[PDB]
Design a protein around this ligand. Structure first.
Ligand SMILES: NC(=O)c1nn(-c2ccc(S(N)(=O)=O)cc2)c2c1ccc1[nH]ncc12
Lengths: 302, 257
């Protein structure tokens, strides 16, 4: 363990958080560039963190071009290191750097196409990401994009119970969750992707809520307040209140102005209220919107 | 859902890999099937005390059997392996798993917080972090969707039968989860509604009632003798209202196969 770690040369810190830190490093013997996610274990003396347990075990079962590759795991006495392929930047940083010019629609199409491929792979392998947001999506200079950070990922061979205290980032949290549904489903990941799709298109977050109720209302305000017809069962959900304001569905051409007929079609299917009817990543891939997809290379301001 | 099929196919693929050595117990110099039975029965209790999911229990047993397939363990350390297994399964499956301290408590301070965490590391090493194992539970969940009139008593009884298989390494270690689940589903369905392994599940799994017979005969025998078994935590757990007291239901005399 200590031996393996000696073969690594830390280059620079590229990210931090509660999990620990992510460094860019180089294999001294092979020259391979890699990403090291360090996790200090003596921090909470509770053993290997649930997030590491889930990320490692689930990620090592997911080998796909659009899913960050876990190359290795070094478990010393006090540290746990996850070794991943290296990617230059996350989608959030890229979106910020593209504020002025905006991300070209052809590249947006390519990214969404790849994200759905990786997501479809996850789902067909009974894995729910549950935390799909711009900063957890990695991109390289070749025009590839991959799902990353499976710390909150869950296997669902057995239905996944919803956290009393939700975990999915607010802006990208699906309505079923906000309304207190009992279980997560593949639909919550698709919803997140939809929000991200729109964000790339308009240069602004689709539903930037300040709170759970504010999040919920911004959605209602854009997609219309759902009723038993649109979503059988809504009124019966835990946190649903009949006193909810009744807003009307805004015209999609005004919600995502830059999109064409196909683009609007796909996005609305990804933001469909009834999770049972919300489109699947598998089906989304067949949507005509990807009829002409290509693989443009981004202008990364590295 | 429509990943249903791709997932079943994947679970069927994975269950064949997380498979422990069927005859590992004869190679263990100090532990026996009876000691294992006692251990698993205790995990069921622990599960009830901490209100853990059934999936957690199933995963722990899977970890324990795989670890024992390649590591000699002595009487006095068997519980330490089991405790670490439960701790790992909890972190993997539970929303809010009990803390290490809690696991050390239910072992009546037989082991140290340090020993448990050290064992967690070793179990992870031995299992090479491959914790997302297919369980009888997962296959039962998949089969329940092919249940025309979804019956809660049938589900509870199938769960009960599936959980009983965890207790006896002999003969259940030689059957795949999907098969045990197949038998558990049929036996429960047959006992509660007189119906049998549905045509839809035959097509889905490729298992015929004939193919499930060997496992079915074994499970029926276990069901019949359940009241006489030395380990009783599962029967007690399943006479609770949340399981419609199905463990009190009388097993049929014959399966008429
Ligand atoms: N949380 C994570 O697991 C995680 N976060 N990053 C990450 C991504 C982008 C930046 S950046 N370019 O500074 O905005 C900084 C860190 C990676 C992760 C795991 C594998 C990785 N390979 N390459 C980067 C990377």
């Amino acid at each position: 363990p200590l031996v393996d770690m000696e073969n690594f040369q830390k280059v620079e810190k590229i990210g931090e958080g509660t999990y620990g830190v992510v460094y860019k490093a180089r294999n001294k013997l092979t020259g391979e560039v890699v990403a090291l996610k360090k996790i200090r274990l003596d921090t909470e003396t509770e053993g290997v963190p649930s997030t590491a347990i889930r990320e490692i075990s689930l990620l090592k079962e997911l080998n796909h071009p659009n899913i960050v590759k876990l190359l290795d795991v070094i478990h010393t006495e006090n540290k746990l290191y996850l070794v991943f392929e290296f990617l230059h930047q996350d989608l959030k940083k890229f979106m910020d750097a593209s504020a002025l010019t905006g991300i070209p629609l052809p590249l947006i199409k390519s990214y969404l196409f790849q994200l759905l491929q990786g997501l479809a792979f996850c789902h067909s392998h009974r894995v729910l990401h549950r935390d799909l947001k711009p900063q957890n999506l990695l991109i390289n200079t070749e025009g590839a994009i991959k799902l990353a950070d499976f710390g909150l990922a869950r296997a669902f061979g057995v239905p996944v119970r919803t956290y009393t205290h939700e975990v999915v980032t607010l802006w990208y949290r699906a309505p079923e969750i906000l309304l207190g549904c009992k279980y997560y489903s593949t639909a919550v990941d698709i919803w997140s992707l939809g929000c991200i799709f729109a964000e790339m298109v308009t240069r602004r977050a689709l539903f930037p809520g300040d709170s759970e109720i504010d999040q919920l209302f911004r959605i209602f305000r854009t997609l219309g307040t759902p009723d038993e017809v649109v979503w059988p069962g809504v009124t019966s959900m835990p946190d649903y209140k009949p006193s909810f304001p009744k807003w009307a569905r805004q015209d999609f051409s005004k919600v995502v102005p830059p999109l064409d007929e196909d683009g609007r079609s796909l996005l609305s299917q990804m933001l469909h209220y009834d999770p049972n009817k919300r489109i699947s990543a598998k089906a989304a891939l067949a949507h005509p919107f990807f009829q002409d997809v290509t693989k443009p290379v981004p202008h990364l301001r590295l | 859902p429509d990943y249903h099929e791709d997932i079943h196919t994947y679970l069927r693929e994975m269950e064949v890999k997380c498979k422990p050595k069927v005859g590992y117990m004869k190679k263990q110099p100090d532990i026996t099937n009876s000691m294992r039975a006692i251990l698993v029965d205790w995990l069921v209790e622990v599960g009830e005390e901490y209100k853990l999911q059934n999936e957690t229990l199933h995963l722990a047993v899977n970890y324990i059997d795989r670890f024992l397939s390649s590591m000699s363990v002595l009487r006095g350390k068997l519980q330490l392996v089991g405790t670490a297994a439960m701790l790992l399964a909890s972190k993997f499956e539970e929303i809010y798993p009990p803390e290490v301290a809690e696991f050390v408590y239910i072992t009546d301070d037989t082991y140290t917080k340090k020993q448990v965490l050290r064992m967690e590391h070793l179990v992870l090493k031995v299992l090479t972090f491959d914790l997302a194992a297919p369980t009888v539970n997962q296959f039962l969940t998949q089969y329940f969707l092919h249940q025309q009139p979804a019956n809660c008593k049938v589900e509870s009884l199938a769960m009960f039968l599936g959980e009983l298989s965890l207790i006896d390494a002999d003969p259940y270690l030689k059957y795949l989860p999907s098969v045990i689940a197949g038998a558990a589903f049929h036996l429960a369905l047959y006992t509660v509604t007189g119906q049998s392994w549905p045509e839809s599940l035959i097509r889905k799994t490729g298992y015929t009632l004939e193919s499930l017979k060997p496992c079915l005969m074994d499970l029926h025998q276990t069901y019949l003798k359940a009241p006489q078994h030395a380990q009783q935590s599962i029967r007690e757990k399943y006479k609770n209202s949340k399981y419609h007291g199905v463990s009190l239901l009388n097993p049929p005399e014959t399966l008429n196969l």
